Write a protein that binds this ligand. Structure first.
Ligand code: SF4
Ligand code: SF4
Ligand code: FES
Ligand code: FES
Ligand SMILES: [Fe+2]
Ligand SMILES: [Fe+2]
Lengths: 633, 633
């Protein structure tokens, strides 16, 4: 079982699933081997009804698609569609929040409100929306309207790109035609240009992909911005992670998917339904997180994280998960079938994301509290059904310090330098106590023993004094292995980094260091890392492609992760991916993505499946940037 | 060679390509056999980096995707993405025209203008835009703004759906949640819901596909509307088709792709460059059409059609094609490589559709005449290079009567009944002289001997007194085989249909019948068939699903054709497809699309690869509708 997951709680549940005859994602993967080599290399096209077409990576025919599409066209078109799909997810999330904010301030959804007025005003200023003598509700209406306007063409480009990157970066991108005109406009143009008999030049196709990836960035940044307005900007919080956060004697409710519009309300209503739960024989409702919506409520409310990504089924296998409340994205549809075995009530809530066999309870923002109560009463009923049934919750959890929004990191640093908060961080980059910054992002992937790449790479980087930040299920991996517990600083961190984390933590009152890794939130909250890195660039007067900052999507899975990796490259970062994207069937495309793009954006992909080697390559990238700034390394 | 194409001109050029060692689409198809059975059946998924996943149609594992995606989820998700891709193409075309109209009336593109003021006013009225006391330029600005507004969410749904179908049809669709909210909004929502871990219910997914197909319909209708405003509504015209329209002693220029914004200007500028051409030793510039942009200039200007779809390379093989001027969609990228062999100058013009090895000449609507002259001078130079080179133009052409816009059909009918023009058509449906109506649409496909299904089905239907209309490369097939020459009425048509075509043609002055098949235009001009059928529905006071009207995408290829077939079903038509879409790997999805959808929209797919059987099934569908109206059959 350690060949499947490096998480001991997951291993324990894999043994339980095995002896109970419950098929898991790992079993489904085994049943898929050997996987198709055409698909693995990207040398397959189904873009018209003359297909399917394939190209042998090596040897004899077929060498070309039926319409004449070359390997580099086919590979580039497939990649572009994955970027567009990712952009569609993050920006769909953002759109949902924009409509929620609009309804809130129009009096149509009283369960929602402006919680972070300071954030609202800062965003308005950034967008050029007047605030002086205006009512907050009117400012918010204008911010929501601006968010929606960025989905289509208008007299300005996408402001959630052009107003969040430094002017010099916008200039580089504009010179290459990479600034998106509208989010949904770019998604549609990708689908058009990649359809049969359209774009058939690899460089042209890939430039289109870079532009669409910036539409994805805009959607991420918009989603973080609007969620902070509505639900509060995260600040440091302490909680726990892993399956041991479930409680046999409570009604255990997982929030799973992505959007806090749903989960945030589940959290607050669950508190109000405590004596209902107790009337049912439970101690209360224990809300726990899975995937990014779990990260959202962890960051804002300290809701403990149950599990993440590939291991999500394992929460159900305990026998203790009374409900799994879903919105969209990254939910294995197997959960609907496993629920039949485990007793769990799986509940979908969004019209565009249903799962055959799950109960659907429409969630309307206009009726959010009532809908939440209906959902939570299903969960209480489920608890009652498992009275007297044995459960097997692994007694395995870690302590997690999280909540490191960009605002929170600046505020923490400000305790060392009140009027120049980024300077103490830069000072320690310059003196070598901080070698550079690495963002871990993205998924787990069944092909990689769960968490092995994240923890292997992070350990090497921490020992080398890298400041490590994380989001999504990368943060999930790290938190479940103790990388968010300050008690582990002495073991994990180099002496430089330890000194810095200790100095900040002591100056912020909590008699000890910051944690080894800073949790910056959900996958849309990769945008927070952009805000931090853009602020450093502006403070230093250099573009992002000069900074000693890298990213690693160490165990990537979703199309969303492909989009994020691509915008990380587009904004100027060396960006590791630890699984193979379907590009190796075309050397010219691989060379563009890993080498020639450096001449366009300054960023580049590092494709490396061996995590020790990946760590070495990431350190080399950081140190090259250090040398370019005239720094020792 | 007759096993490849039933077109004798194509056969002749296949012999020339063979003896010259020039690889064709048919050769590339042969080199692809046997094709992947997983892709053919739709049982393959590459929506995340855990894939590729496949499902055996029958037998043992794999039985399910790695995430738990079932065969019916996988099939439905793939189909939905193809619909979204098609919608992205037609609506991208429409968007381009909307921006062109806006520039024209704002004084930014003087090469363009309002040519059809009557059409402009009719569209404005339909959309609810005031015209009384308004300047045409202001009305046009408002129409262009409305077109652009339909791409995104707003306070109304997509007006290029809701204002073009009868209220009772809008009501049916709205009750099922099928009216699109915005064109690009729907495309993006499809990409989201079909990404990993989102929608996983076949019926839900397919309803999403139906709604996205209506976004495609909107794009088609918008494209026809705007092109008519800018370039004129078609009226009956006489021209010729097939490779014999090329002229060895002229500069032969093919317009290929889709958008008249390009081709229309090539036509008018080519006339002005006649003595330049003659100075070069040519008789003039001979503009000829390929694919839909060829159909656009055929319909409006009588520009002869060279060839279509699968056989497009054959125009180059003659040795006489001096230039091929491209915008986007349905262009085999092989043309860039074949041009090296044949001498032809292949020229791309749009930023999102380039082909490695082709010359790119940006075309800006603001500079259209100058850009056109630059392009045409490349073509004249190419002519000069082939002085003294033998060419082989098959001496094979047909006469084509075309230009049957809906307005043109109504006007023709009005010669028999001035104030109730649809009544003579309905009278002859009722008395059985016209059994029903069949629309042929869509592509050729290399899997089917070229044109075999279109001509086989059309011959059977015509003998059975069906009024046959055609668009796109279905019209192309029919015209190249003589179905648009009135001289062939006695041979092809049943006595009822012959009597009707004769009575209309005689009443319209041209001493003989209308042609056997009415050419209604390009693929976006499938929207014209909708306008005709909606007008018949309104005149009879019934919905479209009661009318004896069917469609046949007899040799479908592009994602666009999938989208069109799907909206034909959604608006209420029995819709034949003569190639296998990738759905047969899921019986539940197949049953929805071919049977249960009848209970939702009244329409349904008829999947039938044998064209004699397809004809029988289409006649049975027509006659079932006749019986439902209380008519003899
Ligand atoms: S677009 Fe070209 S390569 Fe793709 S399936 Fe169609 S013929 Fe094959
Ligand atoms: S979305 Fe599911 S079925 Fe598709 S490639 Fe990923 S794991 Fe496989
Ligand atoms: S041939 Fe296997 S992914 Fe298409
Ligand atoms: S296994 Fe062949 S299309 Fe994927
Ligand atoms: Fe996520
Ligand atoms: Fe077309």
């Amino acid at each position: 079982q350690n060949l499947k997951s490096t998480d001991r709680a997951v291993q324990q549940m894999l043994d339980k699933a095995k002896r109970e005859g419950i098929q898991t994602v790992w079993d489904r993967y085994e049943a898929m081997k050997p996987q198709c080599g055409f698909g693995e290399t990207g040398l397959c096209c189904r873009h018209c009804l003359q297909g399917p077409c394939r190209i042998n990576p090596f040897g004899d025919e077929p060498k070309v698609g039926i319409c004449g599409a070359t390997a580099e066209v086919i590979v580039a078109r497939g990649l572009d569609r994955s970027i567009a799909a990712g952009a569609a997810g993050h920006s769909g999330h953002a759109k949902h929040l924009a409509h929620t904010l609009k309804k809130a301030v129009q009096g149509k959804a009283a369960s929602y409100m402006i919680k972070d007025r300071t954030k609202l005003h800062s965003i308005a200023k950034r967008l050029g929306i007047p605030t002086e003598g205006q009512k907050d509700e009117d400012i918010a209406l204008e911010v929501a309207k601006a968010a929606l306007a960025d989905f289509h063409e208008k007299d300005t480009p996408v402001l959630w790109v052009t107003t969040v990157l430094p002017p010099s970066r916008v200039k580089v991108l504009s010179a290459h035609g990479l600034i998106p005109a509208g989010i949904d406009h770019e998604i549609a143009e990708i689908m058009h240009r990649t359809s049969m008999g359209c774009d058939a030049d690899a460089q042209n196709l890939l430039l289109g992909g870079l532009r669409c990836s910036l539409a994805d960035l805009a959607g991420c940044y918009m989603g973080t911005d609007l969620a902070d307005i509505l639900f509060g900007t995260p600040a440091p919080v302490v909680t726990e992670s892993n399956l041991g956060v479930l409680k046999a004697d409570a009604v255990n409710v997982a929030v799973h998917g992505h959007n806090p519009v749903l989960s945030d309300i589940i959290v607050s209503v669950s508190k109000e339904m405590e004596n209902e739960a107790r009337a049912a024989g439970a101690t209360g409702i224990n809300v726990v997180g899975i995937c990014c919506t779990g990260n959202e409520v962890l960051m804002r409310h300290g809701i403990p994280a149950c599990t993440h990504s590939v291991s999500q089924e394992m929460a159900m296998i305990t026998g203790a998960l009374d409900a799994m409340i879903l919105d969209y994205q990254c939910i294995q549809p197997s959960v609907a079938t496993i629920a039949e075995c485990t007793g769990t009530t799986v509940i979908t809530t969004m019209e565009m994301s249903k799962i055959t066999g799950a109960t659907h309870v429409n969630f309307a923002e206009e009726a959010a509290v009532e809908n939440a109560k209906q959902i939570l009463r299903l969960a209480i009923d489920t608890f009652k059904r498992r009275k007297g049934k044995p459960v097997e919750i692994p007694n395995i959890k870690t302590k997690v310090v999280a909540g490191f929004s960009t605002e929170a990191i600046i505020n923490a640093l400000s305790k060392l330098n009140a009027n120049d908060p980024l300077k103490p961080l830069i000072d320690n980059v310059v003196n070598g106590n901080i070698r550079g910054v690495c963002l871990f992002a993205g998924c787990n992937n069944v092909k990689v023993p769960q968490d092995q790449n994240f923890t292997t790479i992070a350990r090497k980087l921490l020992k080398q004094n890298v400041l490590v930040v994380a989001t999504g299920c990368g943060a999930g991996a790290l938190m479940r292995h103790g990388f968010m517990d300050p008690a582990n600083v002495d073991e994990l961190c180099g002496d430089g980094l330890k000194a810095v984390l200790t100095a900040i933590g002591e100056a912020n009152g909590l008699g000890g260091p910051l944690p080894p890794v800073l949790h910056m939130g959900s996958c849309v909250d990769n945008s927070r890392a952009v805000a931090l890195v853009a602020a450093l660039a502006n403070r230093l007067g250099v573009d992002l492609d000069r900074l000693p900052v890298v990213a690693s999507a160490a165990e990537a899975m979703h199309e969303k992760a492909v989009a994020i990796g691509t915008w990380a490259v587009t904004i100027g970062l060396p960006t590791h991916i630890g699984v193979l994207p379907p590009i190796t069937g075309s050397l010219p495309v691989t060379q563009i993505l890993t080498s020639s793009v450096k001449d366009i954006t300054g960023g580049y992909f590092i494709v490396e499946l061996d995590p020790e080697t990946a760590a070495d390559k990431l350190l080399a990238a950081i140190n090259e940037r250090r040398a370019g700034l005239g720094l020792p390394w």
